Design a protein around this ligand. Sequence first.
Ligand SMILES: Nc1ncnc2c1ncn2[C@@H]1O[C@H](COP(=O)(O)OP(=O)(O)OP(=O)(O)O)[C@@H](O)[C@H]1O
Ligand SMILES: Nc1ncnc2c1ncn2[C@@H]1O[C@H](COP(=O)(O)OP(=O)(O)OP(=O)(O)O)[C@@H](O)[C@H]1O
Ligand SMILES: Nc1ncnc2c1ncn2[C@@H]1O[C@H](COP(=O)(O)OP(=O)(O)OP(=O)(O)O)[C@@H](O)[C@H]1O
Ligand SMILES: [Mg+2]
Ligand SMILES: [Mg+2]
Ligand SMILES: [Mg+2]
Lengths: 219, 592, 24
Amino acid sequence: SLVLDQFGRNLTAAAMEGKLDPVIGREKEIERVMQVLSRRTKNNPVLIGEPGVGKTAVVEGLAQAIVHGEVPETLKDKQLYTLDLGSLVAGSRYRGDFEERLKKVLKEINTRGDIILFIDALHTLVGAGAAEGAIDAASILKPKLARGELQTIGATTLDEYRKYIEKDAALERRFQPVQVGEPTVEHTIEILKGLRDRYEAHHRVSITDAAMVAAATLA
Amino acid sequence: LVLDQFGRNLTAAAMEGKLDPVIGREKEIERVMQVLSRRTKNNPVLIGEPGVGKTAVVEGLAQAIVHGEVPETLKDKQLYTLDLGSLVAGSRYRGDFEERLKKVLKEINTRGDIILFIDALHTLVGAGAAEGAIDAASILKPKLARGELQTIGATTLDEYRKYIEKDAALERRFQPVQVGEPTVEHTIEILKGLRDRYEAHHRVSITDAAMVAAATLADRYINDRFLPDKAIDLIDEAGARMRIRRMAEVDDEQIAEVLGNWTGIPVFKLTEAETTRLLRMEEELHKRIIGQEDAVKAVSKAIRRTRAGLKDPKRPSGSFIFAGPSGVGKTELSKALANFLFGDDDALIQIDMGEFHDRFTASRLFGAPPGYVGYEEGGQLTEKVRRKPFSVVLFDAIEKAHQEIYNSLLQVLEDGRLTDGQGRTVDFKNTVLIFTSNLGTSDISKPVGLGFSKENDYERMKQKVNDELKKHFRPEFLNRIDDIIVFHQLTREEIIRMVDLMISRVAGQLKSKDMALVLTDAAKALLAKRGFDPVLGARPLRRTIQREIEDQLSEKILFEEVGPGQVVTVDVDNWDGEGPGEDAVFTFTGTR
Amino acid sequence: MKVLILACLVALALARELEELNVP
Ligand SMILES: Nc1ncnc2c1ncn2[C@@H]1O[C@H](COP(=O)(O)OP(=O)(O)OP(=O)(O)O)[C@@H](O)[C@H]1O
Ligand SMILES: Nc1ncnc2c1ncn2[C@@H]1O[C@H](COP(=O)(O)OP(=O)(O)OP(=O)(O)O)[C@@H](O)[C@H]1O
Ligand SMILES: Nc1ncnc2c1ncn2[C@@H]1O[C@H](COP(=O)(O)OP(=O)(O)OP(=O)(O)O)[C@@H](O)[C@H]1O
Ligand SMILES: [Mg+2]
Ligand SMILES: [Mg+2]
Ligand SMILES: [Mg+2]
């Protein structure tokens, strides 16, 4: 795109450039969002979970699964863009500027047809660009999200899901809650073993297997 | 035209087959057509909970127009879903919004064959209202008067009153159409009408067994969504999980797998590894609790009722009073049951009721009412079960709560429901509720009456607990409990096995030091005989293992007399089981 | 015998500042 580069970060372009961390495990959660994204209608997974259990990582693990071809043919060669709502609000001082930016984004999604959207902090879609008389981004997306003509991943914490998304009961319907559970200690050691090379290369250190068994156990 | 650049022509979408078949809901499609032909209150606003098919009624109205199944006064009308987003978009200048809405309304009056549909009619308040500009609500309010604007609306029941109702002007013009949540039998007919859409998108086959299961299991195991979609959610995601496997038959069992992934409630058909695991569940709980066989069986009768699809679905999956003496495994069984069902005993929703002895700490269980601080996050009981409906909920020390809390939890055992602070009912029908009591231990001394009396510490202690129970609780609270289990005192032979269960925690922490902890049979006999109280059980044993093993080992490790890579063998010097067992002392010798 | 009257604190906040849409 060019409309969607300035309001989104392409995670599949980031996953080809090795700019996303490896997502070890979480494969039942990536399989789960590939089911919800493969649905006919309401094909919109919201990743709910406690803060830091890897909700943003599941999508980044999904974006790595796309570029390594480990997705179905439904999700094959999808360009996953993380919709920056803050960029989409920014500089919308005139009436309808926010709304026409979101319509130009949604028009670019429909013409390409290969765009998964990741609205990280999906609770910020409620009231997104809702100034004086300014139809928020939630009311614009709710026709698109209900009929399956927009494939959007949300990610919200469990507190922010009951505080902001469950208080708009029409919007929580359009999204399927994919519970991203907190890893076990054994699952977290696997995460640390697969993240080992990223933190060894960054800190110019070597991380013993004892240190990551301790880091998951002691934390 | 003017209406295509803002609205979506639903009638043209129904000609091209792009709208889903809206079967059923016919009595309310034709009721919308009744309201459009009225004298006043001729604007049908479809009110209903989100998901019951309010948009589908007008999508079913568009399909009725293109089939010629409408009256001649609504024949060949063009439904337009006027979205406010396309109407605000653009408008980077003045009046842009009022003239783009005047050109919409002029085009409705010019052709005269437009039935306007304003989905989310509550969002009409504050659309295009720019600085020195009037919103879309103020522009149309008038048009409604002239009756030059028959609109169809669609709000929720909350947002109908929250807005459309209030406006008194709208009241005499808008007519709330109840769009009811369909029944299970209506939803099956919706899913049968929607087979060919979801069987063609996923190129699967959806059996009649699956759609009956989709509408039945969605009504039963969800309390946050609504019949139409809640069940289309199961059909569509199962066809989506199935089309990942062929890269073609969605069955009863494939629906319950999707409901299992989504609610977290195991409703799916038991695998062979898990079927025998529930057969040996009492044997698997006995790996973590010693003795207490009547209590391990009764929580085994409850879990196996649930996985045999056989519990009363108007009542929690298990309801228990664990009662008896302090320290014999009431909380340990609740943690072991949560460790069985979830692999981790921190998955136990442990609501420790001793900190609820105030009258008004019930607001911690269900949440604050709205408008009072902490309403938005309120409920440490209700929100943890709203997220995990299949849960073991431990109400530890239930007798130390206030009486008004039991009346709150009385609806729980009756209906399986609990109204929280907001007012939403939280489904407790899949929970194992465990109300741990400590009654029958405030006088426990081998409880005897007067003299000359000639099996008193259970068969009798049990009826003392049940007597203290019913004089403390309401009788309608205890009749709802499935099993009231008075626990046994731990026998001396159970304390010997409780030594193995407690040394294994100490030995496991020495494995982190690469040390082993071997105890002789005389060492475990001495811990058991000095750790046996016939009135408390296993916490005097814990304290004995701390004082005699752990506090001595904590010195020996810090002295580095024993260290890493060294098996600490624990033998006893002096004494041989036949003495009093308090002249003898442990000795700690490292070997390798 | 005694009753404690608690005190249900209400959530009360100042009115929201709004952000404006410009019409030139
Ligand atoms: N399965 C995983 N494999 C590897 N790294 C993971 C995994 N899950 C999470 N992480 C890492 O954990 C850190 C935090 O994860 P992430 O930011 O996705 O959490 P989150 O649930 O989105 O949190 P928040 O709700 O606060 O945004 C990151 O370094 C991320 O890469
Ligand atoms: N009678 C019906 N026949 C067939 N499908 C139906 C019927 N009622 C609802 N549906 C389907 O259920 C799903 C949700 O319906 P719809 O979007 O109209 O609900 P809604 O109440 O308008 O939702 P919201 O409040 O979020 O706008 C859609 O897939 C719709 O086609
Ligand atoms: N029957 C038992 N089987 C195994 N371990 C037990 C048993 N009873 C007690 N223990 C051990 O003692 C610990 C504390 O006992 P626990 O809290 O389970 O007793 P309780 O009777 O529920 O307590 P209380 O009566 O004070 O409410 C347990 O975590 C476990 O280590
Ligand atoms: Mg995140
Ligand atoms: Mg709708
Ligand atoms: Mg206890």
